[PDB]
Amino acid sequence: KESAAAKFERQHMDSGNSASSSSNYCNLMMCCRKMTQGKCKPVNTFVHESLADVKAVCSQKKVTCKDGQTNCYQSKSTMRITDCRETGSSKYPNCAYKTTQVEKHIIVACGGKPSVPVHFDASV
Amino acid sequence: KESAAAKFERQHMDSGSSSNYCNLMMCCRKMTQGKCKPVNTFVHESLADVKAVCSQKKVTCKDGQTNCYQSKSTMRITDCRETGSSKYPNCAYKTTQVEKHIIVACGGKPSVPVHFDASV
């Protein structure tokens, strides 16, 4: 049972986050996308291109995954992505991340039928 | 079960700013599950300052209860309101940052904020 006091803090308190969206993007997104539950996911990449363009990567340059598997593909062009990396002061449940925006080629593993992205491998 | 494709979308896709704050925070703080919460307010002062309000100006709550207190000074808050085109599960909010007095209900022992009544 969530106590009234705990409920109040969850619904109405935001003292920790900086008012700059440029800086708090990862903190908020990592939390919204459930990657801070139980443990703070160390690193994560978000892609800002269209879903169609990311799915199109599955029929582009074939490359070997970092884990030795062979269903990885590299994007023909760079894509706008955001790197979220856990900071030194991060400590679950207080997960903290540094947000970094860059434009790189991405490598994703594809699977299923039709073949779609199922794993983000890397950015080059 | 979440499919592999759905998992990729949840963990890595964000197709297409501070005006996006409410959309993300409301999601993060789990207030967009089951239905979209129409309105919500986030306080950006330290927890210690908000708790202190419980021993400041005593007022009547909007619902008629009498355990409400108002902050002696303004506080930085963010107002979140469903936009004209919000519709669960696709909740959408308008972010508005302002400085206003807050009114909260206090309860429990020690007496702490347990409900956000309004801002003025």
Swiss-Prot record, chain B:
Allosteric regulation by both substrate and reaction products. Keywords: Allosteric enzyme, Disulfide bond, Endonuclease, Hydrolase, Lyase, Nuclease, Secreted, Signal. It is found in: Secreted. Its main location: secreted. Seminal plasma. Can reach 3% of the protein content of this fluid. The modification Deamidated asparagine is found at D63. The chain holds residues 27 to 150 of 150 of the full protein. Its EC number is 4.6.1.18. It comes from the Eukaryota. This is Seminal ribonuclease. This enzyme hydrolyzes both single- and double-stranded RNA. GO terms for cellular component: extracellular region. GO terms for molecular function: identical protein binding; lyase activity; nucleic acid binding; ribonuclease A activity; RNA nuclease activity. Homodimer; disulfide-linked. The keyword Lyase applies. The keyword Nuclease applies. It comes from Bos taurus. One of its GO terms (biological process) is defense response to Gram-positive bacterium.
